Symmetry: T
Subunit: 141 residues, 12 copies
């Protein structure tokens, strides 16, 4: 069973931009994940928060709750939350970093990920399909 | 109506310094902002927190509560919260960034504002009057 | 009375950009400042020059000519004239720095102000209204 | 039909390192791409070269050969070949960047990709499976 | 009486590494601090949180609650929370900064502390005994 | 009609160096420019100042006076005058930046032009012939 | 006789953009240089490659084949090919660097040229006329 | 037995400052260190030099003289003497680095300890009591 | 005969600070320099300006008016006017750079002098005596 | 048996300067290394190319061809070619980097070697004798 | 009386260079400095040393020896010896820094002085005469 | 004859590491150099000191003692001793820089040598044979 954790501002998906983030809402996104996982023999729980400390605790406590991997979009936290980096290093599950947009075709600061060094890997730029790619890697491993 | 939001540590105005911040308290600051809005035909609501998450949520939900504009003093978050920047970008209201002190006459790191790129404008160094001036701009607009 | 000093290129306001600057000309900004000033118990005189030396001389001399404060738009000199910085520090009047545009949403070089540290505060982003705001601060003080 | 292109040194897959790269060889990687591609509806062709010019050439010419998208692992060239960047930009297919290793857990210079800004997206860190996730995104789109 | 405050991830001590952190748990740590305190004429209260906002709150409030000093290990927030810095500068109590590990023999970003400048001093690298040394300084002062 | 403008120190062509500049004077430079304009059918006025403010007024006022294009050598102002950059962006004439020497074979500070981003093009290293190539571009366009 | 050498990607002139490069193709560009050279009494040979080592072999060899000078557009290799720099420094012919676009109004990396310190001069911005200006310098010289 | 070692300028404690360094002298310092050692079962010797080479020799040699640990205050050499660093790494005793003042509250260059990465730990800012703290750690180990 | 040239803001000597600049006026400074000249056999003339242009012209012309040397205090222009630098380089007289205050004990930007590399030397920190020391050098040479 | 590889422009040895490279040819340099090899019972082969991708294949393939060791002068590629780095790390032979000039006594960019971290050692500044020194090392080893 | 102290390599004055340093030896420099002092009523001792430690002790102990001022040429230690900087801060005498050569006209690393901030001032460029300049300042003060 | 000079810590060769420096002592290294030289027609003497001062004096005096070249291992002084650099520049003998380890494969501060630019050349990475390589170059020269 896999936990999908989303950081700040991902609750406003749908309203926030046209041609930067796309049309799909946070709800439409979980329902996509539920299905991608389901076809593929993976159960999924999906969560979002705007609080660093709540994101950290979800990552700390995923192994205790019986999940066996995390798919994690930290939102803008990916560029500065060393506390989230220490949370992922301090816990045993594999973590896959996911982003809707290509961080390398926007502002300079988005190009640097403080969480990515502790993750299994990173997928980004594929809209909603980034999440799906992570689920296909998780299913095989 | 306009929402005035304040970041960490501004709850302690009055006792943090006397040559850095002034003597006016956060309570007196709101009362000033209420009277300024009111002379001028602007309903105000004034809020403060020490939590990045809570600041984010208040900027995010502000338009859904009926507010027409936000006046925003992120406190030290101004210099590192890309999550707060994204919050302001993800919502439709004009945001005016305000600071009591002149950011350019203190430590180097205060000189950089990560939220300011997404605001209508910035006002700083005037003490409580930076809030005043934000309200005059907003009434006119 | 207050002295309103404008740096290079601000003589070309109106014809220079539609969205960056606006359509309001230098002639109309001065008429707007005279009326903002007036209702309101502040006399203003309004000057523009393309010469660093002329701007410096006007800041150095304002106190001897009776003025009680300076509102100052250095134009692009704000990002390199340390001569102007030292001029404002060499004289006793409070100086308010003002910019039509939001300096933090344009080229990186525009984000750094060398005059700003010696100013009482800074206002930027609000078009002609940045000037109005500096005046409301000054009238109260 | 999708062109999978690989840069310098990936011909030595299987012999460079244990921990860093893993055991699968360039030949086993094309057959794995062959099968991941067929199983799911996609004809693939897989090329590798040690020459920057050759890579630039294969990406320029791909759409004229009737390919519909490029999967691209530039090898170390990802960190400095702006001529490859220009090549991907000068031509109309979507390019997905792919790497075997997690770039952000190795040397600092690995962390920056000059090709990434012109790609649809990037997937990295999943061993041979990074190529598979590239192919599932491409199949859907 | 002394407040001992801990930031993010210290709740996971015991499980996160062996020869980075060791095996002593947060729980065992507090009982160590109680005991070291007790020999030595000092009452301790020990607290831990994964939220910047709550660490900030407790440092702001420690003096109202009657503490005479803070011993503070911010966890990874030490590298980036300019809000915590400000919280420490905003309240009267001496703060001693403590870390289990030597920050200078680990990754580059762990070497810069944005809190240390407002602290009385820093002790780091002696594992749990870093806490003990802070308490020995506080008992003598 | 085209305006050829020269900034500080170019009045001293003749006696500054042998190897850096060569032996042609400003006077002989303008006579060369007059001949090169004539043969090819372009009226030229040639000017020089040591004053930043004067160069700026000249670039501001050129369209109004009836010139169609500016050939511009700002001298050392090239590496720092952002006010000259804005002068050039504030006016509709195309501007061609020119230099007698190859700015990239001298001091490091000479390599960066702050005026060049706003110019149609730049030509440097060809001695007096830089001005001529600028004239041959503009006669054609 | 002069050699005009063109680096990578310049073979796709015509389909890369409209506003960045314009419509004229590599074949139309060589035609133009043929004619411009003929109207000038200069013979020209025109070449293009995607390979660094091939560009290098042409500049090295040129003086052996009887050429008097080289007009050189390295494409993106102008921002990192120190081997090209060394090629131009190891041979006696004068080299003029040429670019279609104004490097200084594009991406930051485009603004540094590692070939330019070794060239007689640089002309950039003027589209296919950059090459015309280079030939006019050279005919005089 | 433990060897306390002290680098340049520390011989002048007492006259050098009152609130930067405080008033206690070198002599008074060794006396406090002997008392702190001697209730507590540690013999200590205490040494100071203005010469890098002499400090280097003392660290090299301490294990030969029978010492079990080094307490080390390199004075300014902490910010630049890699030879000291390599001395601490060339020998097997553990080294505690100690500083009377808080290195993070002073000049920029004082924040980088080149010796620290090789030490068990560091204690700074507690005046003379920094030495005490290093001793209690060492008594325990 | 020697020419002593003074840049911006030095005309306000007297009132600008007490412990930064001290109490002597520009007037009194030129008298002191008049006398220091004569005890020493040197005619002096003393000029101040606020315009970079005018300092530039004065330096360029000094030799034509009959002067044999220049003592120069460029004011804040020392940190940025590469045009001044070029002026000193384009003329044959020896130039001594002088500053009243110690540029190394003030803001970080004051420590870089762009004019110094072309001066015979620099004297800085000695108040009005900086000028005296320059004259003593020049009377010897 | 040892393989000695030379990168771009080392074929022009004899014509590039009298004081930078001196007068000995590539021809004379391979004769020279065949003799230093033969004197000391080392068999040698000597190759040179202008193409990054050829150097890379030669270093990748040397063990396959039965060489025991490489000596490698990358030419200008030592400063930017991470692809050559990875070729060296991908194959099991020891590589000694060699250069004719002292890199540290030329341009800044020449001081950094991106190859040398994966080489046994580096020798540079001894002209042709640099290759010889690398042979006497490989002999012993 | 004043103490003139000289750091490494200045014992070799006279055979290091012709156009950098001069031909005057260390013994001739002393004889000069003695005379310059005496004629003016100011006694002098002059010393030189190659050891940092020895220079430091000479600065530390100068007030104790009855001297009233120090004239200091630290030699290359000026660009890195913070221990010397601290030595100058630790003792009550005024210190004038002096350099034979113009530091701003050599290699970049020479342009930063770590001792200058603690000195009354700095004089450099004037050969032997920089010492003369320092003595005339000291005699008047 | 040739003088071989060793800096700090190199006396402890043998017990410092295995994998960084190996097992051979400074005693055994000097035996090794004695043989290498005598075998090869070269007198050698071999010195080591922990003091920057003493290394400088040995390099300064060497040409006076009749030696005719220096082999020089600065130890960690190679990364910061500009005083050593100037010693090597002030004396006429060719100096060769030698290190046991490859500086480019260790911590980042070791990659930069401030001495290397004044040296004939450098050899590093070959343990004890680095010295041998040095000797053979000098034998020829």
């Amino acid at each position: 069973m896999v936990l999908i954790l989303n950081g700040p501002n991902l609750n406003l998906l749908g309203r926030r931009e046209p041609e930067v983030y796309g049309r799909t809402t946070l709800e439409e996104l979980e329902a996509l994940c539920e299905a991608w996982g389901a076809e593929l023999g993976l159960g999924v729980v999906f969560r979002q928060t705007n609080y660093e400390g709540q994101l950290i605790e979800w990552v700390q406590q995923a192994h205790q709750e019986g999940f066996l991997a995390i798919v994690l979009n930290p939102g803008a936290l990916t560029h500065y939350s060393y506390a989230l980096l220490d949370a992922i290093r301090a816990q045993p599950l594999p973590v896959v970093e996911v982003h809707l947009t290509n961080l390398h075709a926007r502002e300079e600061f988005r190009r640097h990920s403080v969480t990515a060094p502790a993750c299994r890997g990173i997928v980004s730029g594929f809209g909603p399909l980034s999440y799906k790619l992570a689920l296909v890697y998780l299913a095989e491993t």
